[PDB]
Amino acid sequence: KEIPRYENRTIYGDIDFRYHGVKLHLRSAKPGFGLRVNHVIFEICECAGIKDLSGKVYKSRNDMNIAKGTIEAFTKAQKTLDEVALGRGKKLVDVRKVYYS
Amino acid sequence: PRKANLLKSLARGRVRTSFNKYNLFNLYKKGGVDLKSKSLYQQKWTAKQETRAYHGEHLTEKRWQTVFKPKLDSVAQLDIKETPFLLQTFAVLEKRLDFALFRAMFASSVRQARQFILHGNVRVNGVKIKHPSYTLKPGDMFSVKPDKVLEALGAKKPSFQEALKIDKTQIVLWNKYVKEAKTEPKEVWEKKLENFEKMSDSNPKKLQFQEFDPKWAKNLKYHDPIKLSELEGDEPKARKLINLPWQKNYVYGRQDPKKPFFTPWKPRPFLSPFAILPHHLEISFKTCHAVYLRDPVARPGQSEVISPFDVPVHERAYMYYLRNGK
Amino acid sequence: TCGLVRIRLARFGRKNSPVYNIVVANSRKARDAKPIEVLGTYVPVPSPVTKRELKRGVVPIKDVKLDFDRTKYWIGVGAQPSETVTKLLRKAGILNDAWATSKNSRKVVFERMETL
Amino acid sequence: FSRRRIAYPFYPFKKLGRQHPKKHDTNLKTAMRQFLGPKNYKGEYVMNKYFTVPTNHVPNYIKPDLERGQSLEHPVTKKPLQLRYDGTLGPPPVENKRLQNIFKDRLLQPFPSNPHCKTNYVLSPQLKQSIFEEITVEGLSAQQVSQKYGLKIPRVEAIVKLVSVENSWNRRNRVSSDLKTMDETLYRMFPVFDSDASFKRENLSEIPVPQKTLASRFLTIAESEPFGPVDAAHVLELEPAVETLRNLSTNTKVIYGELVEGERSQYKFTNAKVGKVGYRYGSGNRDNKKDRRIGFNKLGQMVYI
RNA sequence: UUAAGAGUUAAACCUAGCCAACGAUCCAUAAUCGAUAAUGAAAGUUAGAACGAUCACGUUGACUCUGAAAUAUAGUCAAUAUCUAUAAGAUACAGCAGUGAGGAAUAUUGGACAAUGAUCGAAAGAUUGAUCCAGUUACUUAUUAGGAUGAUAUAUAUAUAUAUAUAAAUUGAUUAAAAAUAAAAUCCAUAAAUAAUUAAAAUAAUGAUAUUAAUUACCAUAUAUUUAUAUGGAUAUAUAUAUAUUUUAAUAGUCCUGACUAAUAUUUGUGCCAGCAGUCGCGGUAACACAAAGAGGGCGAGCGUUAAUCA
RNA sequence: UAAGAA
Ligand SMILES: [Mg+2]
Ligand SMILES: [Mg+2]
Ligand SMILES: [Mg+2]
Ligand SMILES: [Mg+2]
Ligand SMILES: [Mg+2]
Ligand SMILES: [Mg+2]
Ligand SMILES: [Mg+2]
Ligand SMILES: [Mg+2]
Ligand SMILES: [Mg+2]
Ligand SMILES: [Mg+2]
Ligand SMILES: [Mg+2]
Ligand SMILES: [Mg+2]
Ligand SMILES: [Mg+2]
Ligand SMILES: [Mg+2]
Ligand SMILES: [Mg+2]
Ligand SMILES: [Mg+2]
Ligand SMILES: [Mg+2]
Ligand SMILES: [Mg+2]
Ligand SMILES: [Mg+2]
Ligand SMILES: [Mg+2]
Ligand SMILES: [Mg+2]
Ligand SMILES: [Mg+2]
């Protein structure tokens, strides 16, 4: 699949995604912040090109279900800035992107 | 600090902050850190093991964990390649005086840099500093006693016995060459010119040559054979008894046997693999001085923290030390 | 010293490394108890001077931080300085020679100079 | 999965076969010997590529992956060598094509596994003297020297100070012959900084990244509004990023005390304010704690803060 | 009555109220807190030893005097327990040392008032187990606790890929099975010692610490700005003076290697025994787990373990 | 600036 990534390093916002018995709480992180997440999620992030990520798993911590549900979290529970801007007809500006020109 | 123990084990293959020959081979045969087929703990452990073998191995684990900083520092260019932020995992060690000396190439190792500091051979902007843990701030000038730097960077001074045996061998080879030249100068000239053709101009001898006569072989003179048993223990004797075109009136490597290095000064062997000019220091080698410009930073496509390991290894080590190995 | 209110030195720092607060204190409270006010600090060890700088002729510096306006207030309302504090305040110009003693009573090589 | 893995070379080498009962050898030792080649009677490895320093401002960094771990060369002709079945060193049967067309970026890469570590450029003595003269004699500001020569300002100031120290040392005949030979052999090992080239001149528009900006913040605004760096700076409550470069390119009452003959020290009283001056009461004691504060005296002595 | 309000305490009269399931009353337990310590991402949680703040007590209880302020470490009476002086006596170490006991467990019957304070005195000064120093104790935290080089030993024979042979070569093993650049040897240091000085803590003078730190490796001076060459006192020598000018190192334990959990180079003994174990569990002849050898992985003047706190 | 494991 294709995974949306903000700046090709993290997720756009935060994700609170339930996949069967697994409650994933993912949070985008700053540059230089590592992959501070469950080990299954760490491997998926290593393969997907996510570099900066924080998060926590609640209820079920089954490895297979974590693995499968994190991918629906990445694909379904994310909206890029372009999608939001076009849907709302508004301009979404990244303040840090503009501070450095 | 830790007692240096098996820092150059070939079987372990850890790369040290050192210009050592065994360290050079360990670096050469390494390849990369193999992280495949490993659990996350095993990956982090391997990363920590290798990277702490290089960065600050002489620090105890608890002291390093205390001085470890989660903060990583970078510069944004206002005028593209990805900034390797996590190569700054060990940047905090680079402001230590003992690491600054090694990066300035004023010592062969961080260990030697510690000893140079502890023995009073180092100064920080005037004042003698005897504490390797001393941390430099931007703009600080430090200096080393030039003899210490010359010894770190130079070749080992031979002892009398070893140099005398080497010079015996020198005499034997010189006499063999003289005999060969005298008997058959035709083939010797032919071989000399052919070798001059084969070699590259990079050698100074080729440039000098660019810059038959039977008289040539008449100039070559045999050299008397020396037996060291009678010549042992008398350096003034052997000094005058050795007279060769290259080395004149001194035993091998001991032109002035009162300096702490191979006295006709030549660089130490295997120096070029580790010859790296840091981005955060300005180095003046005539005076054996340096200036600490800034703490090392990461910019797009580059990190000024010199390391033999790739970004993934430092990522895993940083993950290890964030949580104290939890 | 006399009186309930006294300007004196309270010891801080480690063993063999004394530093002091110049404090206005109740006469009965312990030396290192929290005082009425902390008027300043006093480091009794002079600042080291290099041997070449001794050839130049610098004098080692003993560092004193002090709130002058508040110290004059406390002297005004009747607080009584100790002997060491009396010496410190006399050389700061806060107190004059009238606070000197017979033992403490000479040629001036430098003159008390105020800078901004 | 993880086991102990003896760090054998990643490239082929001839391993031990049957060994005489008293050899007592390891494959790692043989691999090192083959990497090093024969040792002279002088204790030298003339046959190893890396034994001797370069002389043409092209660093001779290791390339165990390009050259398949074959580090041997003829010292005079510099032609590659290989260990034949019979224990001699001769020409390779086939020539390597990975050792001729080496990317220019790879030649400045000290370590084969870290693409982000590159050696810096040495400045020629002529350029250093030029910068010293410009700063000290012609009084040109460090900003315009930095722009002219493409060097970061702290590096320019460091060059000025180092050249001053060099001038003193030369006036005192303290730079010995050994020091000059060491300096010139080190100088011929590294690439030379070239002011004119665009890719060899340092970037001059770098500012530290502060914690405040690092967090991503997004604003939803009308589709046509302009939003520039100044508006972004206002949103984050910071100076705009250009004043940071601009500012990086660039009273208390005291009373000195009366000294009299025989007095070994002087008193200087610095004015302070009650409620801000003093050692606080019941402050945290860290002396038995792992983060105890260590400092250094003006004489360089380690002291406890 | 008190300086002063109030069932605060005492007296009189009234009214019938007051508290309580958002927990009264009663019982038990506990000194309390911080810009202090621990921990955590944080909210918080824990501690209340150290630093500081507040309270209470000075063997137990009540009362009284003085005092601005005391149920005072005072006085009276009583209780408890000891000493003698045997009395309308003294003492009560929760002041500093120290002892016995209890306990898993917590130190000197030390030095000085030199510094900072406190008391007395007009001062000279006196006193200070406050305090400052030292002692004991890895209880905690630091810093040091050596760098570079180093796989052989014999022979024979302006160049340089030196080449021949003879010895040997520890444990394991027969090659990806190592121990091991580890040893030894080599070069160069510094610590300690040895001598010279020697500040600073404090000055008007006084230094317990103190065989001080620091500096110099013969001593000064005379110019340069730490490195120099000179002038003069040393210095034995040989024969005033060419010369050199102390000596000099290297000392790590403890746990673990089936998984969780880093530890692949394999072997030996035992045989559901002996034992191991935080959890799963291992041991019945082929034990990666027991007890060991080899090798290996941690942490390191500590390591483990138990008890606990936080997560 | 929130990671889990048997
Ligand atoms: Mg009085
Ligand atoms: Mg394992
Ligand atoms: Mg009333
Ligand atoms: Mg009544
Ligand atoms: Mg109740
Ligand atoms: Mg109680
Ligand atoms: Mg409590
Ligand atoms: Mg307390
Ligand atoms: Mg206590
Ligand atoms: Mg009481
Ligand atoms: Mg008692
Ligand atoms: Mg009582
Ligand atoms: Mg007692
Ligand atoms: Mg007992
Ligand atoms: Mg006193
Ligand atoms: Mg006493
Ligand atoms: Mg054997
Ligand atoms: Mg068995
Ligand atoms: Mg086990
Ligand atoms: Mg066992
Ligand atoms: Mg063993
Ligand atoms: Mg320690």
From Swiss-Prot, chain A:
Q: Any idea where this protein resides?
A: Mitochondrion
Instruction: Give the UniProt record's GO annotations in the biological process aspect.
Output: mitochondrial translation; translation
UniProt-recorded Gene Ontology molecular function terms:
RNA binding; structural constituent of ribosome
Q: Which GO terms describe its cellular component?
A: mitochondrial inner membrane; mitochondrial small ribosomal subunit; mitochondrion
Q: Does the keyword Mitochondrion apply?
A: yes
Query: Which Cys-Cys disulphide bridges does the record give?
Result: none
The UniProt keyword set, sorted, is: Mitochondrion, Ribonucleoprotein, Ribosomal protein, Transit peptide
Tell me more from the record.
Answer: Present with 6680 molecules/cell in log phase SD medium.
As for family, the record states: Belongs to the universal ribosomal protein uS5 family.
Q: What does this protein do?
A: Component of the mitochondrial ribosome (mitoribosome), a dedicated translation machinery responsible for the synthesis of mitochondrial genome-encoded proteins, including at least some of the essential transmembrane subunits of the mitochondrial respiratory chain. The mitoribosomes are attached to the mitochondrial inner membrane and translation products are cotranslationally integrated into the membrane.
| Complexes and interactors | Component of the mitochondrial small ribosomal subunit (mt-SSU). Mature yeast 74S mitochondrial ribosomes consist of a small (37S) and a large (54S) subunit. The 37S small subunit contains a 15S ribosomal RNA (15S mt-rRNA) and 34 different proteins. The 54S large subunit contains a 21S rRNA (21S mt-rRNA) and 46 different proteins. uS3m, uS4m and uS5m form the narrow entry site of the mRNA channel.
Q: What is this protein called?
A: Small ribosomal subunit protein uS5m
Residues represented out of the complete protein: 206 to 306 of 307
Swiss-Prot record, chain B:
Q: Subunit arrangement? A: Component of the mitochondrial small ribosomal subunit (mt-SSU). Mature yeast 74S mitochondrial ribosomes consist of a small (37S) and a large (54S) subunit. The 37S small subunit contains a 15S ribosomal RNA (15S mt-rRNA) and 34 different proteins. The 54S large subunit contains a 21S rRNA (21S mt-rRNA) and 46 different proteins. uS3m, uS4m and uS5m form the narrow entry site of the mRNA channel.
Q: Which organism is it from?
A: Saccharomyces cerevisiae (strain ATCC 204508 / S288c) (Baker's yeast)
Family to which this protein belongs = Belongs to the universal ribosomal protein uS4 family.
Main localization is mitochondrion
User: Which SMART domains does the entry link to?
Assistant: S4
Tell me the keywords, alphabetical order.
Answer: Mitochondrion, Ribonucleoprotein, Ribosomal protein, RNA-binding, rRNA-binding
| Protein name as catalogued | Small ribosomal subunit protein uS4m
- Give all residue intervals belonging to the S4 RNA-binding domain: 95-164
| Localization per Swiss-Prot or TrEMBL | Mitochondrion
Q: What processes does the entry annotate via GO biological process terms?
A: mitochondrial translation; ribosomal small subunit biogenesis
Q: What does this protein do?
A: Component of the mitochondrial ribosome (mitoribosome), a dedicated translation machinery responsible for the synthesis of mitochondrial genome-encoded proteins, including at least some of the essential transmembrane subunits of the mitochondrial respiratory chain. The mitoribosomes are attached to the mitochondrial inner membrane and translation products are cotranslationally integrated into the membrane.
Q: Which Pfam families does the record match to this protein?
A: S4
From Swiss-Prot, chain C:
Keywords, A to Z, come to: Mitochondrion, Ribonucleoprotein, Ribosomal protein
GO cellular component assignments: mitochondrial inner membrane; mitochondrial small ribosomal subunit; mitochondrion
Query: Its Gene Ontology biological processes?
Result: mitochondrial translation
InterPro entries according to UniProt: Ribosomal_bS16, Ribosomal_bS16_CS, Ribosomal_bS16_dom_sf
Location of the protein in the cell = Mitochondrion
Q: Name one GO molecular function term.
A: structural constituent of ribosome
> Which function does this protein serve?
Component of the mitochondrial ribosome (mitoribosome), a dedicated translation machinery responsible for the synthesis of mitochondrial genome-encoded proteins, including at least some of the essential transmembrane subunits of the mitochondrial respiratory chain. The mitoribosomes are attached to the mitochondrial inner membrane and translation products are cotranslationally integrated into the membrane.
Q: What assembly does the database describe for this protein?
A: Component of the mitochondrial small ribosomal subunit (mt-SSU). Mature yeast 74S mitochondrial ribosomes consist of a small (37S) and a large (54S) subunit. The 37S small subunit contains a 15S ribosomal RNA (15S mt-rRNA) and 34 different proteins. The 54S large subunit contains a 21S rRNA (21S mt-rRNA) and 46 different proteins.
Under the heading NCBIfam families, the entry gives:
S16
The entry assigns this protein to a family as follows: Belongs to the bacterial ribosomal protein bS16 family.
This chain belongs to the protein called Small ribosomal subunit protein bS16m
Organism this protein belongs to:
Saccharomyces cerevisiae (strain ATCC 204508 / S288c) (Baker's yeast)
Curated annotation (Swiss-Prot), chain D:
Give the CC-aspect GO terms. mitochondrial inner membrane; mitochondrial small ribosomal subunit; mitochondrion
Which molecular function terms from Gene Ontology are attached?
structural constituent of ribosome
Location of the protein in the cell: Mitochondrion
Asked whether the UniProt record includes RNA-binding among its keywords, one would answer no
Disulfide bridge positions per record: none
Q: Keyword check for Ribosomal protein, yes or no.
A: yes
UniProt keyword list: Mitochondrion, Ribonucleoprotein, Ribosomal protein, Transit peptide
Classification via InterPro entries: Ribosomal_mS45
What is annotated about its quaternary structure and interactions? Component of the mitochondrial small ribosomal subunit (mt-SSU). Mature yeast 74S mitochondrial ribosomes consist of a small (37S) and a large (54S) subunit. The 37S small subunit contains a 15S ribosomal RNA (15S mt-rRNA) and 34 different proteins. The 54S large subunit contains a 21S rRNA (21S mt-rRNA) and 46 different proteins.
Q: Which family does it belong to?
A: Belongs to the mitochondrion-specific ribosomal protein mS45 family.
Further remarks about this protein from its record: Present with 3460 molecules/cell in log phase SD medium.
Functionally, this protein is described as follows: Component of the mitochondrial ribosome (mitoribosome), a dedicated translation machinery responsible for the synthesis of mitochondrial genome-encoded proteins, including at least some of the essential transmembrane subunits of the mitochondrial respiratory chain. The mitoribosomes are attached to the mitochondrial inner membrane and translation products are cotranslationally integrated into the membrane.
Q: What name appears for this protein in its UniProt entry?
A: Small ribosomal subunit protein mS45
Q: What is the lineage of its organism?
A: Eukaryota, Fungi, Dikarya, Ascomycota, Saccharomycotina
